[PDB]
Each structure stands twice: as structure tokens, then as C-alpha cells.
Design a binder for this molecule. Structure first.
Ligand SMILES: *[C@@H]1O[C@H](CO)[C@@H](O[C@@H]2O[C@H](CO)[C@@H](O)[C@H](O)[C@H]2NC(C)=O)[C@H](O)[C@H]1NC(C)=O
Ligand SMILES: *[C@@H]1O[C@H](CO)[C@@H](O)[C@H](O)[C@H]1NC(C)=O
Ligand SMILES: *[C@@H]1O[C@H](CO)[C@@H](O)[C@H](O)[C@H]1NC(C)=O
Ligand SMILES: *[C@@H]1O[C@H](CO)[C@@H](O)[C@H](O)[C@H]1NC(C)=O
Ligand SMILES: *[C@@H]1O[C@H](CO)[C@@H](O)[C@H](O)[C@H]1NC(C)=O
Ligand SMILES: [Ba+2]
Ligand SMILES: [Cl-]
Ligand SMILES: [Cl-]
Ligand SMILES: [Cl-]
Lengths: 418, 417, 414
């Protein structure tokens, strides 16, 4: 009778060992991870890269007759027949100027390049930048690097490219960061006389705070800043460490692109777009990097734009961009105050030779800074390693039947002898 | 002497095994969890449901003499004695309209319904919606579905109700989302001539971005949008998975509500309120769902409001809403640009046959989109499961005394003799 | 041949046990932790303390001739030679007043000057409501910061009970209508260090256990808008060494009852200024002597700036293990509505323009009646290590602690 109770106890114990062991094994092959959040104080923080664009792509006073000829349809200033659209709400002077530039009688077309057009007709930072301050000391427009995006000629402060060393901040708070007073030059905006898809009613700038290791993607990752306010941006540096397969989904390999030195998801997207447009239309857009020839406005109309839209719509499988394992993100909180005060309106108007109306509707102040001298870390950590797996299997294997790998080897010994 | 040192080693080993084993047992019985954060790229994102209200509950030009008679005191247009309050700083015409509407001389009242009054007097989406675009293609006011909230007649885009399929976005950024130009119609706002508790000075709209599975709760979960700016709202889809008892506190059961098909904490809140008001006052407010009769303004005055206030403090234990285990939340970052530009102000003024002053104080553009085509996941994960407990107990049990469950069974066997 | 493969299996098995066991040993000695996020529903939430300053340090109408004499250079209204700045863009009345106050023919405490000349909450506070019930200016406690005379609602200091809210949403919180008094702003005729073009207020939402640090931790609120602030209470629990970096011993400073990272920062600053200049600035607390405007120019400011740059290691403030933080999301609506501008203008005896350029409404509340908890939790405890080493020790060679002791005996005998 005792051998029966022993047989039942050994059988049930071996069954429990079976299901528990297969449980821990399956849990290991899920490759599970859990997250470790930490806050690290630092004596210094590397200030990020700040890219800003004017919402107006190009200045009206800088557009020329040749520009209307080649890119008149693309710039939406002229209709398909090289004639001005509906004149509703058209200033007499502006409409006469445009009508004069669109005469096109005995006109010899000069050579035209999209990057030349954006570079000269775009808003000059030397005119927009009314004042610059970093850590309380003056900055020059030479700190701003020209970057071409979908919005046109844009500028990146502290880009850290072309061998310039990146700036640091040793104190947090509103004073100890970037602080620029900009004039968005609303007088230079393209007149809107007729409704169009490209017609926009916004006035202000668009800013993206990003690491120097990634290029700007201002059309998607930027936030707007409106004239007439001083906007504060409190930043919190975040350092992210992800896990590669089979734990998570990250880009383990450096994967350097021909266009960009360091791999970033932004660089992967704009690289994918660049390759697609170069293959499909044999030309490259203004914002894209490389050595390819830039598109002509005819190529823009008949190939480039429908090609990108078709790439977005047809299938995401062509452009699948994984996230790198080491990522520096910047968190940001926005707040506003009014500019200028009644005590300063006259002084600003006289300082920049403008009317107080103009100052009120054209001046914005951007204040970008770190809230405090610390950074957060978010790390994906492996939850079950092979040492822990063997430890649990050994513990339960020793608890239920008290056997070992040598014991199973001995049972296989008798099986081979049998 | 050797058996004595052996006895000391076995005793100390058995004590240590005792305290370590009870340690792992207690840690298991705390039922602990830890969190798994992950970010997932996606080729498509389901666009959320967007509900907005005008801050002005009902239009002044649509209020009628009968409305003043029944709900004049409730709307704060008339005083306790059904008379207009002080006319201080009242436009002559503006007051003339109200004085004529509140005559009540030889007036034979007609039936009155609160939901009819809000549905007819509230701001019409056909007049507010100056332009609508979703993913660059035009939308109609018919895309917005009417929901009645505490703020009055409100509208939900991509509500996904009545069999409509939920919309998706295949690109991120400002262009590729919902983008509406609204006229908040500040001329239709209730005149404020005298101080009252209900008096408010704000002008604009209130928006809540929420999953289609939940009803809006704009009085608590909404954010404001001011006229004269294009407000960008960058959304981040977050997918949350919680643990039921005994690990955490989540809804293990489906939790069928009578009013709503899907369970949500909001649906639980307005369910608690609706049930409480039906039991105490036998009527429901406009925002509440169901089939009960709507309250009359007298019922509102003498029963509903004090009942809700008594519900907040006295019965704070009475309404307990557990959180569901699988929840889709949307995070948001707001930024603004100025509207309109000087190059467009007059074109807007002529396009909508308004003065530039009006455009300046009445037009707002709302741009709701996903920052990028990805979603975050926040999961509560069990930290100590029974397999790990048995493995650790077996490991320490085998390290300290080298025993097994069969060893203790044999010890009970020898003890049996 | 069988004993040879048995011996090799025991050798290799002991090697595997060695590397796995040392693996768990080293992993345990990393002292790792992982994060536990949780959301806790509550019937009540303790409302935070809200400190706000006007961006304008002191009122122009309250400055007197003596104040111009002593602190004229510091306040930037007068130059080093006690003369008026450039007369470009100067109000005729303001310039006549300043020249009159600067007559300096036949003609001071910093805290008296800030306390009396600063913006009075009794004039700024046009309306106050908390949970729908009226509040008085006496509920705000005066705190002196770098911005000047500032005010803290629900400060909870001096034994006052902390306020609670039993409902979430815009109505059920603090709601104040303020007049920033833009007419009292210092006239700016020439460039100066204090010169600012902003108009509005600065707010910091913080727990009562920590002092305000509004020049660094504050956000702006612009006039002409009602800004809503949705708050989410967060409770953070950190680990002390060797797991993390937290202050296990509170080691509260004499200046403040409860230890906070901010309180440690301003304590270090006060101590440094007392050591180098034998005086304390306006914002600093204690019983120490306040600086004179001459002391400010030649000692205080360069000492503070040099303290930030020269020795950043000197002030090391550890983070406490239990920290209550408040998350916040801002949004705006326009104030006043066209239907309400006239009533406000007449109610407060101001022009409709003045209301447009001076009135702001602040609405601070909890989004919902819950709070988040973020806890650092130990990933490998000594019981788990002994369990893993025991499991692998029993799987690979099947030995025990008693087995190793017996091996020491048999080795000792032979
Ligand atoms: C990602 O960041 C980690 C640190 O956060 C890097 O790990 C360091 O790698 C260097 C080798 O170049 C070592 O000298 C350091 O000791 C490592 N630090 C730690 C904490 O392990 C890692 O190399 C980075 N990965 C990439 C691809 O850049
Ligand atoms: C200010 O600008 C106007 C615009 O052309 C110009 O005529 C005037 O001379 C300028 N004044 C000064 C002082 O430069
Ligand atoms: C435009 O509005 C005015 C009143 O403001 C009205 O008289 C006129 O008929 C309107 N025109 C159109 C085309 O609606
Ligand atoms: C810290 O806060 C937690 C709740 O978040 C509480 O349980 C604990 O008692 C507090 N004190 C310590 C020393 O952890
Ligand atoms: C109202 O404002 C005027 C203009 O400054 C002032 O003279 C008058 O005294 C004010 N009324 C009161 C009651 O303060
Ligand atoms: Ba009752
Ligand atoms: Cl997992
Ligand atoms: Cl727990
Ligand atoms: Cl670790």
C-alpha cells in the first residue's frame, strides 16, 4: 500500500514539475523586458539643436519675373495660363506690381534653380533676428546654419555640424538658454486673393527642438509660435535605451546612410523619400540631401508631388524605419506672456523704425531652456536571463523530485544499457 | 566534536532557510507588478473621436418668448420675479429685444422641452463650420454627430457610432489630420449686464480628444481653444494594459452598462449621475442618456442641482468607478500661430461677408493630428508568478539542507511510525 | 570509458555552474532596480500650493525720492551719475515726475521697499473662487522671490490646513481673475539688465513641502486669456544607495521644516552670500542682515553669478526618496467675450482697452480624482539570489552548503 502512495506522489510531483518547467521555459522564449526609469543630476547639459522656419515660404518683394515664369504655377502666384487669378481683396500697388512682373512679352527666360529661388527669396535671418542671447551673452546669426526643409529656407541654432562644437548650458531656468526676438515680416507674405489648396491664413514661425544627431523634420515634428507673445519652452533631456530583437525592436547596426552620418528615424524617412523620388522622377526636391539634380517646376508639377503622395498611400512596406537603440529626446512645456508691454511698445517701435501696430503684429520672442540640470533615463531591461532560467528550473527540479542533470544522465545510462 | 559542529551548521542552515523561504513567500503574497514601456511603429493609426462645444450654451437670437417664460430664470435671462435685471451697460437694441421677448402680457404659453430648446437654440454646426478637412479632403457638417453635454449642443467628429467606420491616418504632421475653421459666433453670446453666479467672460470653444469607445466628458476632460489662433494639437496614441486583482484594481468582468455598449470610467460616471438623478428626482438632464422624461426648468431648479451637489460630497463613497484593463488614451501637446495673416485678413472678411474686426475675434482653426505614426504601450506585468516561487523555494531548500518535497514526505512517514 | 565521460561531465558541469553562478552574483552586485507605474483612484486630493509673481518687480507710482537715491541704480531707473536715461520714447508726465523725484537738491531697507512698493494682491485680485466658494486676499501668503513680492495660495504654512478638492474639472479648483496693472510698469527708455518687454504673470504649482523657485520652475500666463491648468498629482518613491541616489536621512535645514531639492538650493545660495558678502538678498530667508543697494552692486550679484560658474560641485543637493510632483497641461480661451467686455469695463471702472490689456483669469484644477505613483522597486533581493544559486547548484552537481562543508572535512582528514 505504501508503494502505491509513493507512486502517486512521484507521478503527481513529476507532472507538476513538467507543467511548471514548461511554464518557465515558455516565459523565457517570450524574451520579456520591463522598464527602468531613473533621474540623473548633472553639472552640465548639452543644449539641443533648434530649427525654426517662417510660415511664409518666400518673400514677396524678392520674387522676380523669371521666378514667375518658371515656378509661377508652383508658387501659386499665377494660374495655369500664366495669368493672375481672381483679384478679390487685392491692394492696388501689389496687384500692379504682380501684373507688371507677369507681363511675359518678349521675355527671354533666364536659367532657374529651385535652391537658388528658395535661398534668395526666403526670409533672411539677418532681417528676422532682432536679438539673440544664449546664457545671457550675445549670439550672432553665424551660429544659425541654413537648412532647407519643406517650409523653405530655415535656420538651425547650435546645429553642431560643419565642425562647430556644440553649446552647453551650466544653469537651468528661463534666463540661461536661447532667447531670440524675431520679426516675422508679415509685410512680405504672399498675398492671398483667391482660394487654393496651398492658401494658408497663419502667421508666425514653426520650431523643432531636436538632437544634433538627427536632421530637422519641421513639417511633422515642429510646434507653432505666434507673434505678439514671448513663448517659454521648458525642456527636459531624456536618454532612451532600447533592446534589439528578439527582446524588442531596435536598429542594432549603425546603418549609416550615404546622406547622414548618424542613423536616426528622421534620417531614415527622408532618405527613403530621397531614394524614391530620385528613382521615380530622376530629380530631387529642395529639402533632400545628396548630389542629385534638383527638380524643375514642371517636374514638380508632373512627377514629384504625386510620386510622394503615391509613396505614402500605396504601401508602408517600402519605407520601414526602425528606431535606434540609443535615442536622445527633448521634452517641452510651452507657456506664454504678452509682448510688448505698454511701457515698451514705443521704445520697440522707435528702436526698429516700425509702427506700434507693426511691432504688435510681427514681433515674437522665443525662450528655450532646460527646466533643471538633470536628465531622465528610460531603459528597457531584460526580465529573464538564462542564468535565472536555469536557476528556477534547477530549484523546481530539486524541489519536486530532487534530481539533477547527472541523475537524468544516469537514467539515460540504464536506458542505453537496456 | 564533529557531530556538534555539524549540528550547529544544520541548525543555522535550517534557520536561514526558514527566514529566506518566508521572505519569498511574503513577497509572492504581496502580488507585485512592474511596468513595461514600449514604443511601436505602425503603418496606420486609427484617428480618435474629437468632441467640441462652443463656450456659449445657446444662441441669444434663437430664444423665444415661451423659452423665456418656462426657462427664463434657469437661463439667467430673467430674475426670480420673471423680470429683467439691471440694464446697466446694456446696448439699447440688445435690451430692447429681451424686453420685448419677456413681455408676458396676454401670452398663452405653449409646451416646452429642455432638449428641444438646446437642439434648436444651440450653435448650429452648419453655421459654425466655416471649413472642414480630414487628411486633405473636405468634410461636411454631416460628419459631425450631435451629442448633448453639460455645455449644451456639442459635436463629435469621427464618433464611429450609428455604424460609421472609424477613420485612419497614414501620415503624421499638421496637414494629415482633422483641420477645421470655426466661427464661434461671439455676437450670439448671452448678454452679461449684471453679476450672477452663471456669468462667464470667456469666448471660444472646448475640445476633448477621446477614444470612440468612450462618451465625451467635456466639462472635466476638455481643453480650451481661443479665437484668433490656429491651434495645433499633436496627439500620441497610448495603449495601456492593467492587471486585475489581486495584482491591481481593474475590471475583470465586462461590466455591462444599460446606457453604453462599451465600459469606460466616464460612462460609469455619467451612469452613476443619471441613475442617482432618476432615483431622487425622477427626471434626467439633457446630457444624460436613457429613456427617462427630461426635466422641466422648475425640476432643474428645485431638485436636480442640489441633488447633484449632495451627490458630490455626501455620497462620495457611493460612486466608485473601477478602471478598465485595456484602455486607449491620447496624449496631446498644444501650440499656436496667429490667424489671420495681414495678407489674408481681408480675403477672409470678404469670403465670409464679415468685418475684419469680427474675423479677428471670431475665427479659430483647429488642427488635430498625430505627431508620428507610432503608439506607446504601458503594461503592468506580474513580477512574481507561482513558477518563480516554486523555483526559488526549491533552490534555497536544496541549497541549505538539500531536501525535497519527497524528503519532507519521508520525514512525515518516519514520524508516522 | 564510462568513468572518464562521467569525470568530464562533472568538470564541464562545474564550469557551467561557475559561470552562471558568478553571473547572478555580479548581477546582484549591480544592485538593479526597475520601475513600477500605477494609477490610484481617490475620493479626495490635497490641493497644491500655487505661487505667482507679477513680471513687474515694483509699482512705478509707489517709488519715492529716497528709494531713487539709495536704489536708483539697482532699479535701473537712474544711471551711475544719478541722471535720467535717454529721453527717447518717454511719456511727458512720467519724465516730468522722474526729473522731479530726481531733483536731488536739499534732499532705506530693501525688504521695506519690496514689501511696500511691490504689487498689492488687494488691487490685482479682481475675483477669487475656490471650489465655487469665494476666497479673500488674506488666503494668499506673501513670499519674496527674485521677481519681488509674490503670493502663494494654499501655502499651508504657519499651521493652516491644506485644502482638499472632492471633484475634478475646471470649476472645482482655484480660479482667480487678476489685473496685472500694466500702467504701473517701469518705463523702459534705455537698454538695461532689468529691461523686459513681457506683460503678464508667472506661476509655479508646487507641493506645500517645498519653497517656490519661480524664476526657474515657473510658467507664463498672458493677459487677455483665461488659461486652464489641468494638474495630475504624481507620487514618486526612489531608492537610496546602493540601489539609487536618494537622501535617506532627511537632514532638514534650519530654514525649512521639510527637506526639498529647491530648499537645499536656496539654502546653499544663502549660505554662500552670507560667507562672501556678510548680507542676504531680498528673497533669502532667515534672520541675517539684508543687503544695501551698494552691497548689491559690488558684492551680491557677482558672488551669486560666480557661485554658479566657479564651483558647481560645491552645492550638491541630493533628491529625497518621497517626492510629490504636479503635472500640468495648459490651454486658453479669450477674455472677455464681446458680450462681457462692457460689463467688466464698467464694473472695475476701466476702459475696454484696459481690460483687454490687463485682465487674465487663472483656472487651476485636478483633471480627475486620481493620482499616479511611480516607484523604483528592487529587482534582485538576497532571497532571490540564494534561491537562484541554490537551484543551479542543485541542477548542475546536486551539492549543498553541507556538501561543501563535508568536502572541507574529507579534504582536511586526507
Ligand atoms: C549606447 O549608450 C551606452 C551608454 O549609455 C553605450 O555604452 C558605452 O559604450 C562605451 C563603448 O564605446 C563604453 O566605454 C561604456 O562603458 C559604455 N557604457 C555603459 C554604461 O555600458 C553604448 O555604446 C551606446 N551604443 C551605441 C550604439 O552608441
Ligand atoms: C524708417 O523707415 C522708413 C521706410 O522707408 C524710411 O523712409 C525712414 O527714413 C526710416 N527712418 C530712419 C530714421 O531710418
Ligand atoms: C453681406 O452682409 C450684409 C450685411 O452685413 C448684407 O446686407 C448682404 O446682403 C450680404 N451679402 C451676401 C452676398 O450675403
Ligand atoms: C513615502 O510615500 C509612500 C506612498 O507613496 C508611503 O507609503 C511611505 O510611507 C512614505 N515614506 C517612506 C519612507 O517611504
Ligand atoms: C473711476 O476712475 C476715474 C478715472 O481715473 C477716477 O477719477 C475715479 O475716482 C474712479 N472712481 C472710483 C470710485 O474710484
Ligand atoms: Ba432629498
Ligand atoms: Cl514581455
Ligand atoms: Cl506591491
Ligand atoms: Cl541595472
Amino acid at each position: 500500500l505504501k508503494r502505491v502512495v509513493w507512486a502517486l506522489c512521484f507521478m503527481g510531483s513529476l507532472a507538476l514539475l513538467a507543467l511548471v518547467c514548461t511554464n518557465r521555459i515558455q516565459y523565457y522564449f517570450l524574451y520579456p523586458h520591463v522598464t527602468k526609469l531613473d533621474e540623473v543630476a548633472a553639472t552640465r547639459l548639452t543644449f539641443p539643436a533648434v530649427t525654426f522656419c517662417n510660415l511664409n515660404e518666400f518673400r514677396f518683394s524678392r520674387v522676380t519675373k523669371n521666378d514667375l515664369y518658371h515656378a509661377g504655377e508652383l508658387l501659386a502666384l499665377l494660374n495655369n495660363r500664366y495669368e493672375i487669378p481672381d483679384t478679390q481683396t487685392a491692394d492696388e500697388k501689389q496687384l500692379e506690381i504682380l501684373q507688371d512682373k507677369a507681363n511675359f512679352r518678349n521675355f527671354k527666360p533666364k536659367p532657374f534653380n529651385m535652391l537658388e529661388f528658395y535661398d534668395r527669396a526666403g526670409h533672411d535671418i539677418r532681417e528676422m533676428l532682432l536679438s539673440c542671447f544664449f546664457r545671457g551673452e550675445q549670439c550672432s546669426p553665424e551660429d544659425f546654419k541654413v537648412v532647407f526643409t519643406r517650409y523653405g529656407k530655415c535656420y538651425t541654432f547650435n546645429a553642431g555640424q560643419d565642425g562647430k562644437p556644440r553649446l552647453i548650458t551650466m544653469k537651468g531656468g528661463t534666463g540661461n538658454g536661447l532667447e531670440i526676438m524675431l520679426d516675422i515680416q508679415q509685410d512680405e507674405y504672399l498675398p492671398v486673393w483667391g482660394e487654393t489648396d496651398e492658401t494658408s491664413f497663419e502667421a508666425g514661425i514653426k520650431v523643432q527642438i531636436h538632437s544634433q544627431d538627427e536632421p530637422p523634420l519641421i513639417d511633422q515634428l515642429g510646434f507653432g509660435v505666434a507673434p505678439g507673445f514671448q513663448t517659454f519652452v521648458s525642456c527636459q533631456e531624456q536618454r532612451l535605451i532600447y533592446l534589439p530583437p528578439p527582446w524588442g525592436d531596435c536598429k542594432a547596426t549603425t546603418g549609416d546612410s550615404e546622406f547622414y552620418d548618424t542613423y536616426s528615424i528622421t534620417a531614415c524617412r527622408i532618405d527613403c523619400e530621397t531614394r524614391y523620388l530620385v528613382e521615380n522622377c530622376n530629380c530631387r526636391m529642395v529639402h533632400m540631401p545628396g548630389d542629385a539634380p534638383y527638380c524643375t517646376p514642371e517636374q514638380y508639377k508632373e512627377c514629384a508631388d504625386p510620386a510622394l503622395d503615391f509613396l505614402v498611400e500605396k504601401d508602408n512596406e517600402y519605407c520601414v524605419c526602425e528606431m535606434p537603440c540609443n535615442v536622445t529626446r527633448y521634452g517641452k512645456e510651452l507657456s506664454m506672456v504678452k509682448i510688448p508691454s505698454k511701457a515698451s511698445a514705443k521704445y520697440l517701435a522707435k528702436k526698429y523704425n516700425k509702427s506700434e501696430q507693426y511691432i504688435g503684429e510681427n514681433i515674437l520672442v522665443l525662450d528655450i531652456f532646460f527646466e533643471a540640470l538633470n536628465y531622465e533615463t528610460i531603459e528597457q531591461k531584460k526580465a529573464y536571463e538564462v542564468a535565472g532560467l536555469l536557476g528556477d528550473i534547477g530549484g523546481q527540479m530539486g524541489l519536486f523530485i530532487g534530481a539533477s542533470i547527472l541523475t537524468v544522465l544516469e537514467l539515460f545510462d540504464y536506458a542505453y544499457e537496456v
